[PDB]
Amino acid sequence: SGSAKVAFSAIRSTNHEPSEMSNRTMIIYFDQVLVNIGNNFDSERSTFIAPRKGIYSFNFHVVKVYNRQTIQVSLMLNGWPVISAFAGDQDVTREAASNGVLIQMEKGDRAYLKLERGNLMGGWKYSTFSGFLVFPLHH
Amino acid sequence: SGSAKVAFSAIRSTNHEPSEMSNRTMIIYFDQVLVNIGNNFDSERSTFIAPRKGIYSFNFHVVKVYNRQTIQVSLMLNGWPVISAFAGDQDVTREAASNGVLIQMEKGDRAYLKLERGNLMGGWKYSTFSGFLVFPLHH
Amino acid sequence: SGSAKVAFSAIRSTNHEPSEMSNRTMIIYFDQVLVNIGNNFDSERSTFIAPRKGIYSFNFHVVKVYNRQTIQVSLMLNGWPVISAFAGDQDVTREAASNGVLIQMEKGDRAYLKLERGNLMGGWKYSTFSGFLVFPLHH
Ligand SMILES: *[C@@H]1O[C@H](CO)[C@@H](O[C@@H]2O[C@H](CO)[C@@H](O)[C@H](O)[C@H]2NC(C)=O)[C@H](O[C@@H]2O[C@@H](C)[C@@H](O)[C@@H](O)[C@@H]2O)[C@H]1NC(C)=O
Ligand SMILES: *[C@@H]1O[C@H](CO)[C@@H](O[C@@H]2O[C@H](CO)[C@@H](O)[C@H](O)[C@H]2NC(C)=O)[C@H](O[C@@H]2O[C@@H](C)[C@@H](O)[C@@H](O)[C@@H]2O)[C@H]1NC(C)=O
Ligand SMILES: *[C@@H]1O[C@H](CO)[C@@H](O[C@@H]2O[C@H](CO)[C@@H](O)[C@H](O)[C@H]2NC(C)=O)[C@H](O[C@@H]2O[C@@H](C)[C@@H](O)[C@@H](O)[C@@H]2O)[C@H]1NC(C)=O
């Protein structure tokens, strides 16, 4: 597929608490990048930047522990929520806010996960975020 | 990929209650279509109609609120359930019946989501349904 | 895509209890294979064996009933967990441990689901496991 091979996947490998900057941006950070074909995933910002016009698939599963908060996690496209997922609060099991979607992106569009409500104190180990170009679009 | 570029994604953008017809069909309706490459998703019927033989990927996340019902949501292929997902009933958080699968479809096969058990009173805002042709098949 | 068309999907169609061997391996078994393009999914072992170097997408949803256990399900790559999902224990609804990810695999790498914690007594009907080659890689 040449320059139509674009894919990333990243995970949260520890239960370490959020940083001050993560608290300010509420952008969910993934420390371990498993795939980054095209180097279009910015691992410092946990943001995917589309290299070309196309249909992109995204999936995420944000895993939380008991921390007295319910959460809403949203896939953001240029600062606007496209889809959201939800998780509650209990002390029986880790639980996940999961969702996925296909979206059209232009070159330079940015996709990332934002904690719209709640916090991730206690860590978000086992959280995952991945995406790939399904096919490019011309015009 | 030419005529092998087929993709759709749709979401439920409001918490409005189901219509009379939705009550009769128990087919889950998505008011906002984000992607519809090939125009193979029938937005009036929330049904994907395969344009050609191939392997198709589908994912869904049906989000419910507290409404005194648990739900079973099934991906239907020509009126038969292929996969199902489940959600409970509580008043702490929105929660989702989520699943996904790859299936082979022939031209004219129809895929849609059906509420096999329960109801979506209180709305199903944030629900998502998407799919794409992974690759075509000949013969 | 020729030999770049690789895809599988399998489901658990009954609530039958795990076998002795399933108890010993804790590898989750799927009795009904819906898709197996390339015949790279070993249905006896519920293991996908990559035919070539590439980026592969995997998704799973393991559905449990009340059985006095919480579970952790992990996607294993050559015996090492890549991603995990979690489900609790209650008697209100079936519930699912769900996650998905993209990974790079070499020819001969093996991917399967393992019950890292808990059991699936009471069955795991409606569980699903699927995957496909997103694109091949050279070198
Ligand atoms: C990120 O936000 C968290 C939620 O607001 C912070 O935790 C809160 O910290 C308050 C004092 O900074 C404390 O009164 C709150 O009870 C506490 N809330 C929760 C739910 O834990 C977190 O700050 C961390 O904890 C405090 C005690 C300090 O030691 C910080 O250095 C910790 O990181 C925030 N983390 C930051 C700003 O780095
Ligand atoms: C779609 O099905 C719902 C579940 O059967 C309907 O709600 C039910 O409406 C009954 C009277 O129509 C009422 O006795 C039940 O308590 C109620 N059940 C629940 C769980 O809310 C729904 O009807 C809506 O509510 C009633 C009161 C009417 O105003 C309808 O016009 C409402 O839509 C059904 N909606 C339809 C048929 O449009
Ligand atoms: C697979 O593992 C299960 C969990 O260890 C077994 O169930 C357990 O069986 C014990 C006796 O074998 C019994 O004391 C435990 O209470 C029971 N635990 C649970 C949670 O059910 C299961 O064995 C099944 O049940 C027993 C009674 C025998 O009839 C086996 O033939 C059953 O399969 C294990 N299944 C195997 C080894 O095939």
Coordinates of C-alpha atoms in Angstrom, one line a residue, chain C residues 2-139:
Chain C
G2 CA -3.7 -11.7 -3.0
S3 CA -1.7 -13.3 -0.2
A4 CA -2.4 -10.1 1.8
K5 CA -6.0 -11.2 2.4
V6 CA -5.8 -12.8 5.9
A7 CA -8.7 -12.7 8.3
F8 CA -10.4 -14.8 11.0
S9 CA -13.3 -14.6 13.3
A10 CA -14.6 -17.1 15.8
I11 CA -17.3 -17.3 18.4
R12 CA -18.4 -19.4 21.4
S13 CA -21.8 -20.7 20.4
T14 CA -22.8 -22.6 23.6
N15 CA -22.7 -22.3 27.3
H16 CA -20.9 -25.6 27.7
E17 CA -18.3 -25.8 30.5
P18 CA -14.5 -25.8 29.8
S19 CA -12.8 -29.1 29.0
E20 CA -10.0 -30.6 31.1
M21 CA -7.4 -29.4 28.5
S22 CA -8.9 -25.9 28.5
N23 CA -8.5 -25.9 32.3
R24 CA -4.8 -26.8 31.9
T25 CA -3.9 -24.3 29.2
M26 CA -6.4 -21.6 30.2
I27 CA -6.5 -20.8 26.4
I28 CA -10.1 -19.7 25.6
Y29 CA -11.7 -21.9 23.0
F30 CA -14.1 -20.8 20.2
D31 CA -16.1 -23.6 18.7
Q32 CA -17.6 -21.8 15.7
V33 CA -15.3 -20.3 13.1
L34 CA -17.1 -17.7 11.0
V35 CA -14.2 -16.5 8.9
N36 CA -10.8 -18.1 8.2
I37 CA -9.3 -16.6 5.0
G38 CA -5.9 -18.0 4.5
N39 CA -6.6 -20.8 7.0
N40 CA -4.2 -19.2 9.4
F41 CA -6.5 -19.6 12.4
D42 CA -6.0 -23.0 14.1
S43 CA -9.5 -23.8 15.3
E44 CA -8.3 -26.8 17.4
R45 CA -6.0 -24.5 19.4
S46 CA -7.9 -21.2 18.9
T47 CA -4.6 -19.7 17.9
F48 CA -3.8 -17.4 15.0
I49 CA -0.5 -18.1 13.4
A50 CA 0.8 -15.2 11.3
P51 CA 1.7 -16.2 7.7
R52 CA 3.9 -13.2 7.0
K53 CA 5.4 -10.1 8.5
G54 CA 2.8 -7.4 8.9
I55 CA 0.6 -5.3 11.1
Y56 CA -2.4 -7.3 12.5
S57 CA -5.5 -6.1 14.2
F58 CA -7.1 -8.2 16.9
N59 CA -10.3 -7.7 18.9
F60 CA -12.0 -9.9 21.5
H61 CA -15.0 -9.9 23.8
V62 CA -15.1 -12.6 26.3
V63 CA -18.6 -12.9 27.9
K64 CA -19.1 -14.5 31.3
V65 CA -22.0 -15.3 33.6
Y66 CA -22.1 -15.2 37.4
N67 CA -19.6 -17.7 38.7
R68 CA -18.0 -16.2 41.9
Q69 CA -14.9 -15.1 39.9
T70 CA -13.7 -11.9 38.3
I71 CA -11.6 -12.5 35.2
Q72 CA -8.6 -11.1 33.4
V73 CA -8.3 -12.1 29.7
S74 CA -5.1 -11.4 27.8
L75 CA -4.2 -11.4 24.2
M76 CA -1.0 -13.5 24.2
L77 CA 1.8 -13.1 21.6
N78 CA 4.2 -16.1 21.8
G79 CA 3.2 -16.7 25.4
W80 CA 3.5 -13.0 26.5
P81 CA 0.5 -10.8 27.3
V82 CA 0.2 -7.8 25.0
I83 CA -3.2 -6.4 26.2
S84 CA -5.7 -7.4 28.8
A85 CA -9.4 -7.0 29.6
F86 CA -11.4 -7.4 32.7
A87 CA -14.9 -8.4 33.8
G88 CA -16.4 -8.6 37.3
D89 CA -18.9 -10.9 38.9
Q90 CA -22.6 -10.3 39.3
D91 CA -25.9 -12.1 38.6
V92 CA -27.8 -9.2 36.8
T93 CA -26.4 -9.6 33.3
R94 CA -23.8 -11.4 31.2
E95 CA -20.8 -9.1 30.9
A96 CA -17.7 -9.0 28.7
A97 CA -14.0 -8.5 29.0
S98 CA -13.3 -6.6 25.8
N99 CA -10.1 -5.1 24.2
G100 CA -8.4 -4.8 20.9
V101 CA -5.0 -3.7 19.5
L102 CA -2.8 -3.6 16.5
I103 CA 0.5 -5.5 16.7
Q104 CA 3.4 -6.3 14.4
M105 CA 3.8 -10.1 13.9
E106 CA 6.5 -12.0 12.2
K107 CA 5.8 -15.2 10.2
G108 CA 5.1 -18.0 12.7
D109 CA 4.2 -15.7 15.6
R110 CA 1.2 -17.0 17.5
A111 CA -1.7 -15.0 19.0
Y112 CA -4.4 -16.4 21.3
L113 CA -6.5 -15.5 24.3
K114 CA -5.6 -16.7 27.8
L115 CA -7.6 -16.5 31.0
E116 CA -4.9 -15.0 33.2
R117 CA -7.2 -14.9 36.3
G118 CA -10.5 -16.4 37.2
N119 CA -12.4 -19.2 35.4
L120 CA -15.2 -19.5 32.8
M121 CA -17.4 -22.0 34.7
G122 CA -21.0 -21.3 33.6
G123 CA -19.7 -21.0 30.0
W124 CA -18.6 -18.2 27.8
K125 CA -21.3 -18.2 25.2
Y126 CA -21.3 -15.1 22.9
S127 CA -17.5 -14.6 23.3
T128 CA -15.8 -13.5 20.1
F129 CA -12.3 -13.3 18.8
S130 CA -11.3 -11.9 15.4
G131 CA -8.3 -10.5 13.6
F132 CA -7.0 -9.5 10.2
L133 CA -3.8 -8.4 8.4
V134 CA -4.0 -4.6 8.1
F135 CA -1.1 -4.6 5.7
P136 CA 2.1 -6.6 5.1
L137 CA 5.6 -5.3 5.9
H138 CA 8.7 -6.0 3.9
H139 CA 12.4 -6.3 5.2

